[PDB]
User: Which sequence fits this backbone?
């Protein structure tokens, strides 16, 4: 501080200033997101797919900043996504809007040893009565609209219009094939990207769905010993053309000899490894192809790690290079294996159905990934929100319809308590409007208009805005009795977690 | 010419110069007080309790630096207090509400907000305004000694409590309305150079420095008669307009004495007729006026008909064209008391006059020349309560607490009011609580948590009655503590402050012309 | 400016002096937009570092403004000359006047020949002329539920401070109908100029006391002559009695003070002799316009007298006209021996004076030359009456503006924003350059409400949402009725169903601005040969 030396990225002014500033400015995404929005972010991690996103996690994945809080705080926001898929586009803006509320009190000179407490105290008071404002619950998880209702806040939060069929599709996916007894799996039920068809045509094909081509035959038996090999067939010794015509009529044969009789013993020992399906991370040679069909081994011409990973995951596989007679440490998991036409594409389908280890797989059909990923993003954050492992989601008013409910809870409780925390608690009664504004922003009105008319509804529970004409002038969309609902789980987290972030980030001076 | 300035930027220009004035004299305000230093470009020391005094003496900006003088001069004309309070409320509130509200995009509901945060303000003020009795100079004391200490004077306060508290009761508008609330004509503040607190007598009537200036002028005829011209004098103080030419040197002098000779021949007629008093409203110069001293007469000169005719009713005189002419007494005796208390040989006529139109000049004597103006401002700060208490026995104990009573109860009505209305309502209601907490600053300790508890105390126990004082910075009953906030004051200090608010909120452009 | 800066004087050489004019037209219009009407915010107009003024008036700023641009030149006069027309359209012309000269010359230059485009900004205005004159639809005060009473009320209830529209639903009726006078504009109209209305201080914060006949302003304590005798007749006097000076002057030419008082004292007694003749003729009360000084008061106090003096001539004028009396039928002299006449007797059932609030008026009951009423506004202070009276005058005026015209148009741009898409589709009707020509104006009937409700911060795109909710293919209709509400009430920012409120304007004030709208456009065209002067 008074030294030429030592270190800091934070402190003094900065702690009061820079640590609050950009952490807020992060919220611009979540300021436009979480709840129905057409507003999106083109995020180019340079993939040659230029990625539309409102999802904070993969917005913040690129974002890097010297502000130690904003450096850190994305942790709690990403620690959130781990715990709930939805509510994450809520996390960053709420505290971010709740932050400079304290900084204004810092301009008033209300201490860091003071203000955040009242937040934390009203963070209690929230999570105290936050379970009281729980209303519904998602009970039968085989049921569509108990699942698709939770989904109907969550995908909605990420993205608006596509949500409805997705919610159906995701509930029609029956992520309840996992009994949700404490069981859920992100790889077993997986997204499978299919270029073309519709995204309304995007389906759930149970099993493991590989848009990669099943080559030659299908499995000998449906309980396969699944040969998942990074390079089982790279070719053994390749043919050549020398003269821009032929090299030599004589030199042609000996390389097929090495190719064939190796890939003979190769695929014969792909048969002697007992592989019913050989799953090739690399290419296939037509000789091994011929061998894969004679030796009766389902062949997959090419495999992305997307296959190989889930293969290693599900099958117990290890994707292996082979120029040699193999052995299966992969074996199978699967009770069924197929070439099915899904996306109306010939698809490598590994399959079985159980409660546990069961692969029941989303198949997304879309012209691009930016279609099939951000929507998947929108999708899976409901699938993620489906993951509670308390089967009843304890559905609160969705669409953030509990804002106005807790808002008058906290502001009345901020009236009760004396001392500077009464402000902080009343300041905690404030940042509610962020998403109602974030809605009203992408909807196009100020939360004041919204929230004051929803200060007129007082205790309501149902009405809260979104992206819609109802969210502009009427200040009302019915987000409790809706079809649009959200679990108490992410309610337990985001209010606390975004606080857990905001706790010490003003305290950190160095 | 062709120029356009815009809205919130002009509103900010209205914010800027005012926001500076909102600070020092706010610190100078109340029991926790300061001074505003003014650096002259040559270095001369200037410090006052009034920043507008500092503004008049330095650069004043065309924005509210000009206006916060104006509307405080507007505040200075009316109750003669709160100018210090108006500057610090207006620019503050304009600095407070606008940004929060204009980012919500409206002056519009803010247009309604100031009079709504005025509404409950005016409302519960009068409701918690505690009756303080007019008949008692002691039960007018705690309020008027509070008012004269709003500018931090207990010095001549109690003495202004003596003279003025019954004096505004003796102030009568001759419309026979109030009376009780009195503009300054029928009640004036006029002083005698030097003197002493007993050379200060309670003086409830007009005081003519010109009634008796000299001893050869009238001496204690307890009911004089003020003669205006018309017979004893005439309507000519003239010039014979003698022809002139270069060859006549004596001709320049005759036209010079001719103005005096007609002034003389009227006073010569006064020498002939010999009243006790003549009022010459055209005025008489030194020459002919020295001739009225041998006739046993005072010469009252170059005063006004209004004052004279009131003086007539005030001192027991009346307008009659001659002393030998005797028609009737409109006032046989119109005086409560007749005094002349001289400083030096120059005489000063004190005529104490009860419920006359008069001037109600309230004799105000500093111990010497200099603090006379103190006693003037104090007897002026006196008559503020004196016209407030006599009008309104109700006046709020407070001004630390009344400022709290207003603020906390205002947004407390947003709990009742709500709507989109609440947001500009509270925002124009936000800045008020800070005024005591601005003074609780110089109480040391925590200026915030005190008022915080006091803000709780506001609706908890009581508001302006039992509340924060600038002397305490903490809860005391402002009645039991004797700190009083005149009801007429709060109805104004905020008003003219919120008057300049909506205006400077609504003035969105300054053209080159 | 813009373009070549080396040739001064509105040679920017090409549209540079057209655009610098239209961008100035837009700029000079930027002054008045946020100034438009009362919702248009008062500007604080710097006249100098030490000189300012605060006005939202459209014609007040621009008279103060300097304009060396030709299009800025035509805009100031249009604000002023339409103010010179009415005062409705100080603000109104300014907004589109920026547009139409910007809208005119563009196609005029395109010429198949410039004559074609000129009507496009006249034609739609002409088609607005009919539509505007086709409006009885809103602003009609004569057609109420209570008629004049609600025409009072709704116009009072527009400016309402209070119970305005309760007792004041009566008064604007009472005020216009207490007036028998020859001022007439077009169809028969009754002056709100001649209304005798005075202020009360105390008693009711808001009440209107309705008294028969004219009530003459008077006060006690300023006259030592007792002025009060109950009678049926008054003497209205243009005349004076003063003991100081009545026929008397001063002498600076005379040295002797004896000369002044000798001719002075004669005039003092003849005042007491003249009061006897004015009284004893017919009149126990005698109403005198000429006054007495506070000094002269003493002379009339201690020498005694009778008369009612220092009374407003405007009333004593109106009273004698109302009460059948005469203001001066007799005196060619001020003499005391000059007899008084019985024609100056007020013809009245009684001469009575109600002092109330500590405010006294001389009530002339049953004025027999014509009916009258002097309505006493009850405030607790006198400025409460102005809030009433300001609510009254415009209520008086708007009814008088409905006394100006039967056909009357709604305040606010629901009149315009209707024809807007009506006539901007009528652009397409003729098509060609006229679809350009007609739209340029008919796109601009959208913009006035975009200024109007936004001055109320209503985001008039929400208003035009409500406006063109009324404005339909099914409702193209000014009619005289509303199957669409064509009213836009500018005390709000959104339409209200008041057609009797004081904000609305007659058809007289509008078709005027229609010329003014098109006036900034082609006025600047007729020039030829842009040049440079050394």
Assistant:
């Amino acid at each position: 501080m008074l030294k030429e030396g030592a270190k800091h990225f934070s402190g003094l002014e900065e702690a009061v200033y820079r640590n609050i500033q950009a952490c807020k400015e992060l919220a611009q995404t979540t300021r436009t997101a979480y709840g129905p929005n057409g507003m999106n972010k083109m995020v180019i991690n340079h993939l040659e797919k230029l990625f539309v996103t409102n999802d904070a996690a993969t917005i913040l994945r690129e974002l890097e900043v010297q502000h130690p809080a904003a450096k850190m705080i994305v942790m709690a926001s990403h620690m959130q996504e781990q715990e709930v898929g939805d509510g994450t586009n809520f996390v960053l803006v709420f505290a971010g809007a709740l932050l400079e509320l304290a900084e204004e009190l810092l301009r008033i000179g209300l201490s860091v040893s003071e203000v955040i407490e009242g937040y934390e105290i009203a963070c209690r008071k929230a999570h105290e009565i936050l379970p009281n404002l729980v209303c519904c619950s998602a009970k039968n998880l085989r049921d569509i609209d108990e699942v698709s209702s939770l989904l109907r806040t969550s995908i909605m939060s990420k993205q608006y219009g596509n949500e409805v069929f997705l919610a159906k599709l995701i509930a029609q996916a029956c992520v309840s094939i996992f009994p949700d007894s404490g069981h859920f799996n992100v790889d077993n039920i997986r997204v499978c990207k299919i270029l073309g068809s519709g995204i309304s045509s995007s389906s759930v094909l149970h099993g493991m769905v590989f848009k990669k081509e099943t080559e030659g035959d299908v499995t000998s038996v449906k309980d396969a010993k699944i040969a998942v090999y990074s390079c089982p067939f790279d070719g053994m010794i390749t043919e050549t053309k020398g003269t821009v015509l032929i090299k030599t009529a004589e030199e042609l044969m000996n390389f097929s000899k090495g190719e064939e009789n190796l890939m003979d013993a190769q695929v014969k020992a792909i048969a002697d490894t007992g592989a019913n399906v050989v799953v090739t991370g690399g290419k296939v040679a037509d000789m091994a192809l011929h061998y894969a069909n004679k030796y009766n081994i389902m062949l997959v011409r090419l495999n992305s790690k997307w296959d190989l990973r889930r293969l290693c995951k599900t099958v117990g596989a290890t994707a292996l290079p082979r120029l040699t007679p193999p052995v299966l440490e992969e074996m199978g998991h699967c009770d069924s294996v197929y070439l099915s036409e899904v996306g109306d594409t010939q698809v490598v389908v590994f399959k079985h159905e159980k409660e546990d280890g069961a692969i029941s797989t989303i198949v997304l059909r879309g012209s691009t990934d930016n279609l099939m990923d951000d929507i998947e993003r929108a999708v899976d954050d409901g699938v993620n929100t489906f993951k509670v492992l308390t089967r009843d989601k304890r559905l609160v008013p969705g669409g953030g319809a509990t804002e106005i409910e807790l808002a008058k809870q906290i502001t009345s409780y901020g009236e009760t308590c004396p001392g500077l925390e009464q402000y902080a608690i009343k300041k905690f009664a404030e940042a509610f409007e962020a998403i109602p504004r974030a809605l009203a922003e992408n909807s196009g009105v100020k939360a004041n208009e919204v929230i004051s008319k929803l200060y007129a509804v007082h205790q309501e529970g149902n009405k809260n805005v979104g992206l819609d004409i109802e969210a502009e002038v009427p200040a009302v969309k019915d987000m409790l009795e809706a079809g649009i609902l959200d679990t108490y789980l992410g309610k337990y987290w985001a209010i606390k977690l975004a606080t857990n972030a905001a706790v010490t980030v003003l305290r950190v001076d160095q | 010419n062709t120029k356009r300035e815009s809205g919130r930027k002009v509103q900010s220009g209205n914010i800027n110069a005012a926001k500076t004035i909102a600070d020092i004299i706010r610190t100078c305000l109340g029991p926790k007080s300061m001074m505003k230093m003014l650096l002259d470009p040559m270095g001369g020391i200037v410090m006052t309790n009034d920043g507008n005094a500092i503004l008049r003496e330095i650069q004043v900006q065309h924005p509210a630096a000009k206006s916060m003088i104006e509307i405080s001069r507007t505040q200075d004309e009316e109750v003669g207090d709160g100018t210090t309070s108006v500057i610090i409320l207006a620019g503050e509130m304009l600095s407070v509400a606008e940004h929060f509200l204009e980012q919500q995009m409206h002056p519009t509901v803010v247009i309604s907000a100031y009079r709504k945060a005025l509404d409950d303000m005016i409302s519960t003020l009068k409701k918690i305004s505690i009756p303080v009795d007019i008949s008692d100079s002691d039960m007018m004391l705690n309020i008027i000694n509070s008012s004269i200490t709003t500018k931090a004077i207990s010095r001549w306060s109690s003495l202004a409590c003596n003279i003025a508290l019954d004096a505004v009761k003796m102030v009568q508008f001759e419309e026979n309305g109030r009376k009780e609330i009195d503009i300054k004509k029928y009640a004036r503040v006029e002083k005698i150079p030097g003197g002493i607190i007993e050379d200060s007598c309670v003086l409830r009537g007009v005081m003519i420095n010109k009634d008796v200036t000299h001893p050869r002028m009238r001496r204690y005829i307890k009911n004089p008669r003020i003669v205006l011209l018309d017979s004893s004098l005439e309507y000519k103080k003239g010039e014979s307009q003698t022809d002139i030419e270069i060859t006549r040197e004596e001709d320049f002098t005759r036209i010079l004495q001719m103005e005096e000779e007609y002034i003389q021949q009227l006073c010569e007629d006064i020498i002939q007729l010999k009243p006790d008093v003549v009022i010459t409203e055209k005025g008489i110069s030194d020459l002919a006026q020295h001739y009225l001293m041998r006739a046993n007469i005072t010469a009252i000169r170059r005063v006004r008909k209004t004052d004279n005719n009131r003086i007539a009713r005030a001192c027991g005189a009346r307008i009659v064209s001659r002393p030998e002419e005797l028609r009737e007494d409109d006032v046989g005796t119109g005086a409560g008391l007749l005094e002349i208390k001289k400083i030096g040989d120059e005489y000063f006529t004190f005529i104490t006059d009860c419920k006359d139109p008069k001037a109600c000049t309230i004799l105000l004597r500093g111990a010497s020349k200099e603090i006379l103006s103190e006693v003037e401002r104090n007897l002026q700060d006196a008559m503020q309560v004196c016209r407030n208490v006599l009008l309104d026995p109700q006046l709020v104990p407070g001004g630390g607490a009344s400022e709290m009573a207003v603020a906390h109860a205002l947004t407390e009505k947003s709990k009742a009011m709500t709507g989109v209305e609440q947001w500009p309502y509270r925002a124009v209601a936000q800045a008020l609580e800070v005024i005591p907490r601005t003074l609780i600053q110089n109480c040391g300790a925590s200026t915030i948590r005190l008022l915080t508890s006091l803000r709780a105390k506001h609706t908890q126990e009581n508001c302006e009655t039992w509340g924060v004082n600038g002397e305490t910075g903490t809860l005391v009953d402002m009645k039991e503590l004797g700190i009083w906030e005149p009801l007429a004051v709060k109805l104004q200090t905020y008003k003219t402050a919120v008057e300049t608010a909506v205006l400077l909120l609504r003035i969105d452009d300054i053209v080159s012309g | 400016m813009e373009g070549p800066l080396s040739v001064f004087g509105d040679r920017s050489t090409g549209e540079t002096i057209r655009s610098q004019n239209v961008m100035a037209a837009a700029s000079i219009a930027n002054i008045v937009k946020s100034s438009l009407g009362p919702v248009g915010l008062d500007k604080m107009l710097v006249d100098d570092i030490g000189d300012v003024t605060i006005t939202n008036d459209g014609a007040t700023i621009l008279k103060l403004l300097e304009v060396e641009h030709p299009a800025a030149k035509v805009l100031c006069e249009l604000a002023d000359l339409q103010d010179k027309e009415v005062g409705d359209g100080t603000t109104s012309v300014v907004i589109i006047a920026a547009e139409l000269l910007k809208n005119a010359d563009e196609l005029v230059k395109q010429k198949i020949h410039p004559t074609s485009v000129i009507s496009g900004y006249r034609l739609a205005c002409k088609e607005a002329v009919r539509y505007i004159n086709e409006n009885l639809i809103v602003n009609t005060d004569e057609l109420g539920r209570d008629c004049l009473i609600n025409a009072a009320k709704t116009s009072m209830s527009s400016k309402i401070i209070g119970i305005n529209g309760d007792f004041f639903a009566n008064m604007v009726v009472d005020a216009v109908l207490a007036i028998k006078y020859t001022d007439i504009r077009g169809q028969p109209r009754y002056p709100v100029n001649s209304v005798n209305i005075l202020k009360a201080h105390g008693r009711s914060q808001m009440e209107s006391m309705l008294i028969s006949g004219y009530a003459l302003n008077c006060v006690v304590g300023s006259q030592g002559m007792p002025k009060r005798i109950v009678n049926a007749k008054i003497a209205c006097l243009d005349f004076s009695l003063q003991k100081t000076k009545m026929k008397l002057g001063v002498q600076v030419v005379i040295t002797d003070p004896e000369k002044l008082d000798q001719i002075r004292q004669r005039e003092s007694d003849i005042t007491k002799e003249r009061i006897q003749k004015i009284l004893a003729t017919g009149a126990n009360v005698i109403l005198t316009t000429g006054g007495i000084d506070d000094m002269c008061l003493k002379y009339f106090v201690e020498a005694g007298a009778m008369a009612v003096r220092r009374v407003l001539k405007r009333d004593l004028k109106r009273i004698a006209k109302a009460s059948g009396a005469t203001i001066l039928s007799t005196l060619a002299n001020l003499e005391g021996e000059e007899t008084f006449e019985a024609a100056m007797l007020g013809q009245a059932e009684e001469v009575v004076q109600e002092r109330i609030c500590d405010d006294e008026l001389i009530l002339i009951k049953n004025t027999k030359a014509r009916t009258s009423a002097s309505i006493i506004l009850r405030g607790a202070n006198d400025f409460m009456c102005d809030e009433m009276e300001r609510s009254l005058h415009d209520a008086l005026c708007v009814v008088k503006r409905v006394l100006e015209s039967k056909s009357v148009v709604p305040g606010g741009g629901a009149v315009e924003a209707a024809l807007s898409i009506y006539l901007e589709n009528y652009a397409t009707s003729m098509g060609s350059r006229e679809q350009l020509a007609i739209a340029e104006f008919a796109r601009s009937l959208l913009v006035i409400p975009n200024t109007l409700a936004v001055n109320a911060a209503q985001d008039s795109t929400d208003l035009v949402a409500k406006l063109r909710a009324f404005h339909n293919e099914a409702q193209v209709n000014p009619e005289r009725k509303n199957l669409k509400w064509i009213g836009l009430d500018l005390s709000n920012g959104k339409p209200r169903d008041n057609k009797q409120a004081g904000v609305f304007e007659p058809t007289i004030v509008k078709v005027k601005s229609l010329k003014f709208a098109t006036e900034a456009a082609i006025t600047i065209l007729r020039i030829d040969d842009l040049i440079k002067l050394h």
